[PDB]
Motif scaffolding. Structure first.
Motif, PDB file in Angstrom:
ATOM      1  N   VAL B 274       0.821  -1.144   0.012  1.00  0.00           N
ATOM      2  CA  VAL B 274      -0.123  -0.070  -0.121  1.00  0.00           C
ATOM      3  C   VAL B 274       0.984   1.284  -0.086  1.00  0.00           C
ATOM      4  N   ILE B 275       1.915   1.075   0.767  1.00  0.00           N
ATOM      5  CA  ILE B 275       2.819   2.422   0.758  1.00  0.00           C
ATOM      6  C   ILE B 275       3.530   2.776  -0.355  1.00  0.00           C
ATOM      7  N   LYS B 276       4.159   1.643  -1.042  1.00  0.00           N
ATOM      8  CA  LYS B 276       4.430   1.737  -2.451  1.00  0.00           C
ATOM      9  C   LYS B 276       3.735   2.214  -3.492  1.00  0.00           C
ATOM     10  N   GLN B 277       2.477   1.612  -3.471  1.00  0.00           N
ATOM     11  CA  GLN B 277       1.419   2.222  -4.266  1.00  0.00           C
ATOM     12  C   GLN B 277       1.138   3.469  -4.427  1.00  0.00           C
ATOM     13  N   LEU B 278       1.178   4.081  -2.840  1.00  0.00           N
ATOM     14  CA  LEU B 278       0.649   5.244  -2.415  1.00  0.00           C
ATOM     15  C   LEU B 278       1.810   6.179  -3.140  1.00  0.00           C
ATOM     16  N   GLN B 317      13.004   4.794  -0.836  1.00  0.00           N
ATOM     17  CA  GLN B 317      14.574   4.103  -0.995  1.00  0.00           C
ATOM     18  C   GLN B 317      14.301   2.738  -1.765  1.00  0.00           C
ATOM     19  N   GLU B 318      13.601   1.812  -1.343  1.00  0.00           N
ATOM     20  CA  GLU B 318      13.629   0.473  -2.121  1.00  0.00           C
ATOM     21  C   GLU B 318      13.123   0.754  -3.490  1.00  0.00           C
ATOM     22  N   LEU B 319      12.078   1.629  -3.637  1.00  0.00           N
ATOM     23  CA  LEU B 319      11.816   1.925  -4.950  1.00  0.00           C
ATOM     24  C   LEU B 319      12.572   2.566  -5.972  1.00  0.00           C
ATOM     25  N   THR B 320      12.229   2.461  -7.212  1.00  0.00           N
ATOM     26  CA  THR B 320      13.093   3.070  -8.436  1.00  0.00           C
ATOM     27  C   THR B 320      12.400   3.969  -9.229  1.00  0.00           C
ATOM     28  N   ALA B 327       4.045   2.082 -12.766  1.00  0.00           N
ATOM     29  CA  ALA B 327       2.933   2.622 -12.033  1.00  0.00           C
ATOM     30  C   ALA B 327       2.138   3.514 -13.217  1.00  0.00           C
ATOM     31  CB  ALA B 327       3.068   3.271 -10.738  1.00  0.00           C
ATOM     32  N   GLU B 328       3.207   4.456 -13.753  1.00  0.00           N
ATOM     33  CA  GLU B 328       2.407   5.315 -14.798  1.00  0.00           C
ATOM     34  C   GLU B 328       1.879   4.649 -15.874  1.00  0.00           C
ATOM     35  N   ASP B 330       0.619   1.634 -15.757  1.00  0.00           N
ATOM     36  CA  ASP B 330      -0.615   0.760 -15.266  1.00  0.00           C
ATOM     37  C   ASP B 330      -1.711   2.120 -15.060  1.00  0.00           C
ATOM     38  N   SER B 331      -1.284   2.846 -14.679  1.00  0.00           N
ATOM     39  CA  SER B 331      -2.398   4.141 -14.631  1.00  0.00           C
ATOM     40  C   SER B 331      -2.608   4.857 -15.885  1.00  0.00           C
ATOM     41  CB  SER B 331      -2.155   5.105 -13.748  1.00  0.00           C
ATOM     42  N   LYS B 332      -2.062   4.553 -16.727  1.00  0.00           N
ATOM     43  CA  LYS B 332      -2.184   5.195 -18.345  1.00  0.00           C
ATOM     44  C   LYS B 332      -2.287   6.702 -18.143  1.00  0.00           C
ATOM     45  N   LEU B 333      -1.258   7.299 -17.522  1.00  0.00           N
ATOM     46  CA  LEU B 333      -1.122   8.720 -17.264  1.00  0.00           C
ATOM     47  C   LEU B 333       0.467   8.848 -17.469  1.00  0.00           C
ATOM     48  N   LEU B 334       0.594   9.925 -18.331  1.00  0.00           N
ATOM     49  CA  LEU B 334       2.164  10.326 -18.589  1.00  0.00           C
ATOM     50  C   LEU B 334       1.860  12.016 -18.870  1.00  0.00           C
ATOM     51  N   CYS B 335       2.724  12.543 -18.311  1.00  0.00           N
ATOM     52  CA  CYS B 335       2.873  14.160 -18.277  1.00  0.00           C
ATOM     53  C   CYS B 335       4.038  14.446 -18.309  1.00  0.00           C
ATOM     54  CB  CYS B 335       2.261  14.845 -16.937  1.00  0.00           C
ATOM     55  N   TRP B 336       4.981  13.871 -19.561  1.00  0.00           N
ATOM     56  CA  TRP B 336       6.625  14.190 -19.748  1.00  0.00           C
ATOM     57  C   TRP B 336       7.322  14.038 -18.472  1.00  0.00           C
ATOM     58  N   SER B 337       7.396  12.679 -17.931  1.00  0.00           N
ATOM     59  CA  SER B 337       8.098  12.497 -16.983  1.00  0.00           C
ATOM     60  C   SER B 337       9.402  12.501 -17.115  1.00  0.00           C
ATOM     61  CB  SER B 337       7.717  11.116 -16.288  1.00  0.00           C
TER      62      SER B 337
END
Lengths: 33, 441
Positions: B274-278, B317-320, B327-328, B330-337
């Protein structure tokens, strides 16, 4: 008061923490089983 | 009442007292008995302005006998005034605890009759149930299941009724059985809470939002309920963070921080997930970093914000960047990351994109096809997402060109050609760049 409401919310959280702590204690009983 | 000090409760009590029917008038119209009329008059003198005490039962019988809306409103107002009064109300609660029939009658009266009368009766029932002896989870559940309570909670225009309902639910949440009842009520009426949170993110409204946040935190105190609510609304954490950032109230911010921490608390199931998803979707880490930089007058709120920031930093810290990109996608949302424009990130993630039979490439192609299907709307967010997808496809074609054949088989070239005729200048330029990277010079 606001402080009393915060304490009551913390008391409810403490009761939830006690329930969570009881589950840990109950887990020991399962291990004892 | 239990929370009669609230402005909404006072307004409801005043509205109930506005429609007042005299006991003598009710007796004359055959709506009550002489003894019942005397008991009602004594109760009115004691509370509305001598305590009825044992005479409360004849007053309740007269109220039931007097089916008129004005008489019911007067009875509800008298009950609310007695509950507010220190001398009265407590005796009625004790009588209801000793005799469940009186408690059942009070519960049935709650959320019944006129809207003001229903609110007053519900407040009186909540005040009676506040005592441990007279507390009843079944009565609270029955009152919540009533249509009047649902209408009051969902009454967006009537902010006072929604605030009163939220305050009553929060007060009832103290009792663990009533806490489970309130959790079930929240599971039933989640859209009302979501609308309240959205209004808070975007006074009577402030009090209603604070009560809703307190009820949400009380529900999330139980790990099972918190885990259930985490999957109920994935954007609930983001909405709460936005409301906390927008709101300047210390108490509201502290409640929002506590609610956010409870969702990511180790007690709740899938706490790490849950923390990683948030942190991946709602941008928990930058929001927490901004909150930590900001100064908060409240010490408890500051400590909660610091704990949330530490938890978010530990999760990130564990995430990259690969997890954020996944995640982006999967959410189908991209804003020029930044990873999209980072040459090093694309170089180090080219193999990952082509991995698993180019699963990431296939997902990107599907997202591009969906955007092309959604290109008729041509929204600004949709256009930005389409441009980002086109840039990602161009990068995945330039590096490791094996995915180019997969994209062509999956209609990626057709999607790019269709986007080349898009009205938007940026989308057309991105499609032209992708075509040039495909076969162009």
């Amino acid at each position: 008061e606001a402080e009393e409401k915060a304490k009551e919310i913390q008391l409810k959280a403490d009761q939830e923490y006690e329930i969570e702590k009881t589950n840990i204690v109950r887990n020991e009983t399962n291990n004892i089983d | 009442k239990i929370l009669m000090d609230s402005t909404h409760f006072n307004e409801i009590r005043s509205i109930i007292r506005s429609r007042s029917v005299a006991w003598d008038a009710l007796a004359r119209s055959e709506e009550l008995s002489e003894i019942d009329a005397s008991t009602a008059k004594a109760l009115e003198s004691i509370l509305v302005k001598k305590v009825n005490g044992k005479t409360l039962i004849p007053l309740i019988h007269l109220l039931s006998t007097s089916d008129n809306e004005d008489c019911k409103k007067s009875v509800q107002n008298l009950i609310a005034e007695l509950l507010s009064s220190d001398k009265y109300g407590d005796d009625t609660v004790k009588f209801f605890q000793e005799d469940p029939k009186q408690l059942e009658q009070l519960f049935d009266v709650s959320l019944k009759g006129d809207f003001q009368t229903v609110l007053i009766s519900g407040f009186n029932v909540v005040s009676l149930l506040v005592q441990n002896g007279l507390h009843n989870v079944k009565l609270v559940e029955k009152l919540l299941k009533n249509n009047n309570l649902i209408n009051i909670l969902q009454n967006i225009e009537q902010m006072d009724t929604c605030y009163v309902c939220i305050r009553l639910l929060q007060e009832l949440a103290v009792i663990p059985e009533y806490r489970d009842v309130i959790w079930l009520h929240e599971k039933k009426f989640m859209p009302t809470l979501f609308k309240i949170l959205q209004r808070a993110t975007d006074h009577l409204g402030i009090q209603l939002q604070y009560h809703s946040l307190l009820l949400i935190w009380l529900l999330t105190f139980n790990p099972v309920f918190a885990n259930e609510l985490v999957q109920k609304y994935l954007s609930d954490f983001l909405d709460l963070l936005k409301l906390v950032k927008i709101t300047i109230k210390e108490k509201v911010s502290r409640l929002c921080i506590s609610i956010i921490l409870q969702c990511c608390s180790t007690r709740v199931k899938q706490h790490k997930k849950v923390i990683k998803q948030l942190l991946l979707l709602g941008n928990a880490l930058p929001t927490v970093q901004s909150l930590s930089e900001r100064k908060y007058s409240d010490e408890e709120l500051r400590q909660d914000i610091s704990n949330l920031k530490e938890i978010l930093e530990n999760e990130y810290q564990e995430l990259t960047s690969f997890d954020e990109y996944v995640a982006e996608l999967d959410s189908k949302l991209l804003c020029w990351s930044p990873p999209h424009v980072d040459n090093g990130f694309w170089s180090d993630n080219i193999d990952e994109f082509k991995k698993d039979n180019y699963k990431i490439f296939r997902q990107l192609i599907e997202l591009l096809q969906a955007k092309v299907r959604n290109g008729d709307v041509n929204a600004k967010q949709e256009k930005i997402i389409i441009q980002v997808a086109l840039n990602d496809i161009t990068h995945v074609v330039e590096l490791l060109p094996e995915s180019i054949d997969v994209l062509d088989k999956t209609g990626g070239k057709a999607d790019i050609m269709e986007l080349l005729n898009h009205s938007d200048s940026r989308v057309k330029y991105e499609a032209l760049k992708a075509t040039q990277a495909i076969i162009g010079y």
